[PDB]
Amino acid sequence: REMLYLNRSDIEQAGGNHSQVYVDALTEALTAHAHNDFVQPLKPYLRQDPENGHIADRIIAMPSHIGGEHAISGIKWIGSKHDNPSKRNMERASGVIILNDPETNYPIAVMEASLISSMRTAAVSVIAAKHLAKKGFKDLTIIGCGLIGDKQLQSMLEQFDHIERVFVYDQFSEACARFVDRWQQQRPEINFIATENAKEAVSNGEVVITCTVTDQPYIEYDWLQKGAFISNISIMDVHKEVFIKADKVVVDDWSQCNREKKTINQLVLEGKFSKEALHAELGQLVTGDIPGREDDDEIILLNPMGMAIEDISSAYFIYQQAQQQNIGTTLNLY
Amino acid sequence: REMLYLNRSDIEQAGGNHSQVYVDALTEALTAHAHNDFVQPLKPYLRQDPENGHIADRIIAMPSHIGGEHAISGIKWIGSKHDNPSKRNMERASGVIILNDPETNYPIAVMEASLISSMRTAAVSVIAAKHLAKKGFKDLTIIGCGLIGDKQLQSMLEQFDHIERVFVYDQFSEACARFVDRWQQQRPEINFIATENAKEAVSNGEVVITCTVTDQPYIEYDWLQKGAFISNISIMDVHKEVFIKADKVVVDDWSQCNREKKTINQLVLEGKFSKEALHAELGQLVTGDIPGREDDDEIILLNPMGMAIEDISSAYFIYQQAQQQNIGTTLNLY
Numbered sequence: 001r002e003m004l005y006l007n008r009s010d011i012e013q014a015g016g017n018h019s020q021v022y023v024d025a026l027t028e029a030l031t032a033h034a035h036n037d038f039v040q041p042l043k044p045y046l047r048q049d050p051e052n053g054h055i056a057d058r059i060i061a062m063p064s065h066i067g068g069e070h071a072i073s074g075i076k077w078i079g080s081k082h083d084n085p086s087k088r089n090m091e092r093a094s095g096v097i098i099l100n101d102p103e104t105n106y107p108i109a110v111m112e113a114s115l116i117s118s119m120r121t122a123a124v125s126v127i128a129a130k131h132l133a134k135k136g137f138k139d140l141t142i143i144g145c146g147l148i149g150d151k152q153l154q155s156m157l158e159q160f161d162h163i164e165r166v167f168v169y170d171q172f173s174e175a176c177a178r179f180v181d182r183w184q185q186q187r188p189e190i191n192f193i194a195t196e197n198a199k200e201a202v203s204n205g206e207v208v209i210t211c212t213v214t215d216q217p218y219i220e221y222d223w224l225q226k227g228a229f230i231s232n233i234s235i236m237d238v239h240k241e242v243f244i245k246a247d248k249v250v251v252d253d254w255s256q257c258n259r260e261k262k263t264i265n266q267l268v269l270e271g272k273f274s275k276e277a278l279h280a281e282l283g284q285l286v287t288g289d290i291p292g293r294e295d296d297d298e299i300i301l302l303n304p305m306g307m308a309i310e311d312i313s314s315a316y317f318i319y320q321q322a323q324q325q326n327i328g329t330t331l332n333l334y
Numbered sequence: 335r336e337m338l339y340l341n342r343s344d345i346e347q348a349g350g351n352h353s354q355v356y357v358d359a360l361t362e363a364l365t366a367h368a369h370n371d372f373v374q375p376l377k378p379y380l381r382q383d384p385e386n387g388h389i390a391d392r393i394i395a396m397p398s399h400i401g402g403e404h405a406i407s408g409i410k411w412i413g414s415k416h417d418n419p420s421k422r423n424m425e426r427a428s429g430v431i432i433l434n435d436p437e438t439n440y441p442i443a444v445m446e447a448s449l450i451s452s453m454r455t456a457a458v459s460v461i462a463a464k465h466l467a468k469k470g471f472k473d474l475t476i477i478g479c480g481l482i483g484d485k486q487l488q489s490m491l492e493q494f495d496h497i498e499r500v501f502v503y504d505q506f507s508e509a510c511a512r513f514v515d516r517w518q519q520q521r522p523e524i525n526f527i528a529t530e531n532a533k534e535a536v537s538n539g540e541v542v543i544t545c546t547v548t549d550q551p552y553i554e555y556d557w558l559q560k561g562a563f564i565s566n567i568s569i570m571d572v573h574k575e576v577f578i579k580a581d582k583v584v585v586d587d588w589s590q591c592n593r594e595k596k597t598i599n600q601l602v603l604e605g606k607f608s609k610e611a612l613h614a615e616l617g618q619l620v621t622g623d624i625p626g627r628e629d630d631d632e633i634i635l636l637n638p639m640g641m642a643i644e645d646i647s648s649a650y651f652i653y654q655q656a657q658q659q660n661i662g663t664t665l666n667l668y
């Protein structure tokens with residue numbers, strides 16, 4: 001019995017370094033989600049300090065099974081220390097994805113997780129923007145210049161050739177400076193603007209993507225242009241009023257969002273939100289059960305907690321491409 | 335950044351093939367358990383058929399962190415298909431353990447899981463028997479001749495040189511036959527008896543270990559000799575009356591046992607059991623907070639759901655031994 005090991009370099013070589021593989025994988029997984037052909041138990045958070053602990057110091061286990069023609073199971077096991085970049089010069093998040101053959105349940109692949117996690121999260125923004133952003137939008141905003149922001153930006157630019165300007169803000173000015181400098185050279189024909197505050201960045205974006213590590217909301221509803229689509233990838237950035245005031249609120253998975261201690265659950269627990277109030281789950285937009293944007297004045301909020309089936313589908317596509325190209329290291333289980 | 339990969343062969347070479355490493359690792363982990371120096375979120379079960387599914391068709395995620403001098407985090411991700419041995423000639427269970435450095439949360443080891451899982455489960459029986467079995471017990475019973483039974487038997491014989499006879503039963507006669515034949519040659523001075531039914535095996539054991547895959551209890555209280563210690567490793571074998579009638583009931587972890595849909599929770603939900611009724615958690619016996627066996631007429635039941643800290647502590651000890659011996663395959667994460 002063997003397993004394929006794919007490090008981040010191997011993942012890049014097998015196509016994991018381009019958005020399209022993730023967009024393809026997620027369109028499939030989200031269709032399976034809409035058709036309920038998956039299983040996704042709740043994610044446990046392992047924290048060393050469940051009391052007295054930074055919200056981004058954790059390891060999350062994210063198991064899932066996707067059914068269908070090419071059923072697959074697996075887990076993403078993804079750790080985080082808020083401190084890693086500033087104190088250790090290391091990426092915040094790290095970890096592994098294990099894929100399992102659903103016939104036998106045996107593990108068949110062990111793969112590095114963080115590039116795939118970041119790219120599938122960027123693909124979530126792409127697919128949602130296809131349904132929820134103004135068609136042909138020109139102005140993109142990125143808040144937070146870490147690995148998630150970098151990939152969000154890369155993928156949007158790969159997937160939307162009409163983007164003209166990119167407003168970028170980070171609380172840490174130097175991170176923003178270097179981020180825009182790097183990108184300005186990567187893409188000379190797009191105009192990147194390092195902004196002075198978040199309000200300037202948010203106010204000027206037709207699509208706004210949050211990519212920070214914060215536990216306190218700063219994005220106000222009146223910052224948002226009519227017609228804006230906000231992909232709230234880092235979840236906590238957005239004031240509650242935005243959930244209430246947006247014309248349409250979309251999540252990836254309601255049961256995961258309407259979960260004890262979370263923003264949506266809190267509005268629900270008060271009498272300020274419900275499932276009736278929710279516009280769609282993302283998969284329902286992909287499959288066409290529910291329409292997306294219907295006019296260009298609508299302000300639309302996506303609040304995606306992240307779903308294990310996204311990681312597992314992404315990793316499975318990449319595993320397959322790697323096997324096709326004989327990329328990776330064959331390990332024996334026994 | 336690197337991780338050590340240890341396949342089952344590497345684990346054996348690093349000492350993982352002898353009970354003592356597991357006994358040492360678990361004595362440590364169970365002391366940390368008694369002192370509450372750990373974190374162990376509830377295990378999710380991923381099942382393809384949560385409705386219409388065999389109870390042993392699943393993959394379980396088992397994360398934990400152990401504190402102390404050599405704090406460690408990790409996860410056991412362990413799959414099962416009941417069908418694997420009979421239909422595919424494959425071991426029922428399989429999987430991987432990932433170890434994580436708690437300073438950065440980065441993964442540092444990827445290890446095969448099933449030998450370690452089976453051995454740490456055998457160590458649970460050893461440690462409990464040290465506290466709960468009649469001193470110098472001569473007659474051991476094993477029900478179920480798969481990998482768990484094999485390791486339970488190996489470890490008991492390694493750890494208790496006074497065992498004279500071993501009664502063995504399996505529902506599948508041929509499995510029992512070959513099991514005792516193999517062992518009789520491995521240990522010519524011990525007497526192995528293949529029994530005709532479970533009652534004969536259970537009735538004749540001073541320590542009884544359950545190692546089957548069943549969802550229906552068959553072990554009756556009146557089968558048990560006064561003085562017996564039952565290590566109910568496969569959980570479902572034991573009739574409810576035994577929980578009620580045993581002089582002392584011990585679990586590994588109450589919060590895990592007193593969990594919705596489980597035997598103990600059910601007796602609790604009725605008014606037939608409580609935490610007051612429970613004799614000890616295993617760690618409390620190890621640390622001496624609560625006495626073990628106090629006389630030789632007591633009938634004692636251990637009901638251990640299995641704890642992630644056992645796997646993680648075991649894997650960590652083995653990882654360390656392997657590094658000391660330069661065993662295993664160095665992988666690059668990136």
Ligand SMILES: NC(=O)c1ccc[n+]([C@@H]2O[C@H](COP(=O)([O-])OP(=O)(O)OC[C@H]3O[C@@H](n4cnc5c(N)ncnc54)[C@H](O)[C@@H]3O)[C@@H](O)[C@H]2O)c1
Nearest residue numbers: 092121144145146147148170171172211212213233305306
């Ligand atoms: N929704 C999802 O499925 C999903 C998936 C993966 C990651 N995430 C989230 O993405 C976020 C970004 O992760 P990352 O790995 O890039 O982190 P990172 O540490 O690499 O970068 C975070 C960046 O945000 C900046 N920042 C922090 N607080 C800020 C604030 N209040 N305003 C402006 N800038 C701020 C930091 O200076 C840093 O440059 C994390 O919160 C992570 O949990 C969400």
Ligand SMILES: NC(=O)c1ccc[n+]([C@@H]2O[C@H](COP(=O)([O-])OP(=O)(O)OC[C@H]3O[C@@H](n4cnc5c(N)ncnc54)[C@H](O)[C@@H]3O)[C@@H](O)[C@H]2O)c1
Nearest residue numbers: 426455478479480481482504505506545546547567639640
């Ligand atoms: N408590 C714990 O922490 C823990 C840890 C690991 C495994 N387990 C449990 O150990 C059990 C044994 O696992 P395994 O990997 O050896 O399985 P396996 O399939 O290798 O073997 C099970 C054996 O039991 C026999 N059997 C099945 N039903 C029986 C019955 N009703 N009476 C008598 N014999 C019967 C089978 O013929 C087979 O030989 C599993 O139920 C597993 O969930 C418990």
